[PDB]
Structures are given as structure tokens and as C-alpha cells.
């Protein structure tokens with residue numbers, strides 16, 4: 726996260742760290758057995774770390790659970806990063822408590838201008854911001870028009886832009902797969918962009934609201 730502030734500890738209880746030796750992507754707990762992340766973060770097996778604030782220090786609130794199934798959206802495309810969403814089933818249910826709580830799936834698509842929170846342990850591009858501690862940032866959803874203007878012909882129905890066209894505040898590598906929460910619901914998954922915090926290049930997020938049927942279906946047949 727670039728240009729944000731350190732999240733208050735456990736203020737984003739749905740935030741998870743996907744670990745394969747080291748943290749490599751974020752994700753969001755949607756229920757006791759399932760985590761939503763970005764399909765480009767795919768690995769056949771991953772360790773989900775919940776209840777984290779500082780990923781390099783034991784705080785006593787962590788729950789480390791290995792995955793049972795990792796399911797990329799059937800139409801994920803590595804050529805253009807389209808339908809960049811994936812589900813991870815936990816091998817054991819997570820224990821919900823003060824440090825671990827799921828985030829609600831969207832009841833509808835958030836309109837342009839809606840203020841959201843994005844968080845993660847990714848590149849901060851700053852000497853003061855310690856990326857080991859969960860970072861937070863408030864970003865507004867941009868209109869499709871603004872999004873297409875920034876990335877002509879690269880925005881599909883499964884993507885939306887959020888952030889500031891003026892730059893300075895944005896998600897970045899390592900935040901990938903993480904949550905974008907607006908009005909208490911998961912509206913986006915950190916997906917891609919050109920650089921981080923560069924003017925004219927806002928972040929691009931997977932549009933969760935159009936995947937509700939795939940998500941709910943998948944979270945019952947598996």
C-alpha cells in the first residue's frame with residue numbers, strides 16, 4: 726500500500742496473508758471455510774494466515790491453516806488477467822473471534838464515487854511505512870469512463886478502477902488478492918495496474934459483485 730496509514734491492529738479482521746515460505750498475496754475470509762483471493766496468485770496448496778497485524782512477529786492472535794482446495798475462476802485468463810478471482814477452501818474451519826471475522830459478499834455493485842478501504846502487506850515505496858505491519862488506504866471507485874480512459878480497451882466487465890488519477894495513493898505488488906471493502910462488503914480484489922501510485926494509472930480490481938453466483942455455487946459443491 727502506497728501513501729496509506731498503518732491499520733489499527735485487527736481493524737480489518739477478514740484480511741488474510743497467503744504464505745508459501747513468505748507472504749506473497751493477500752486474501753479475504755468470507756466464511757469459516759472459505760477465502761477469496763486473486764486467480765493470478767494461484768498455487769495448488771497455500772498456508773492461510775489469519776489474525777495477523779505484523780506478519781514477522783508472533784502476536785498470539787494468528788491461526789495458520791493449510792488449504793484443502795484452490796479454485797481459480799473457470800474463465801481466468803493469464804493473457805489479460807481477466808476474471809482474476811479465486812476461492813481457497815480451508816482444510817479446517819477458522820475460529821471466528823476478535824481477531825478473525827469474515828467480510829460480507831456484495832448485495833449489489835457499488836457505484837462510482839463510493840469510498841472504500843484497501844489493505845495489505847505489499848510494497849509501500851516509502852522508508853517510513855513498514856510493510857510488515859498491515860497498511861490501510863481509503864480509495865474511491867472510478868467510473869468506467871475514467872477507467873477505460875486510463876487503460877484503453879483493457880477493461881472488461883470483470884474489472885473496475887479505484888484510486889486517484891492524480892497518483893500518490895494506491896495498492897501495489899504484495900497487496901494482490903487483497904480486499905477492497907465498501908459499506909461493509911467485499912467489492913474488489915486487488916488485481917493489477919501500471920506501476921503503483923503513478924498519476925493517470927489507477928489500480929484495477931476484480932469486480933466481485935458480478936461473481937456472486939459463481940462464489941455461492943462453488944462454496945457448496947466443494
Ligand SMILES: NCc1ccccc1
Nearest residue numbers: 896897898917918928
Ligand atoms: N497499483 C495497482 C497494482 C496492484 C497490484 C499489483 C500491481 C499494481
Ligand SMILES: [Ca+2]
Nearest residue numbers: 779782783784
Ligand atoms: Ca504476527
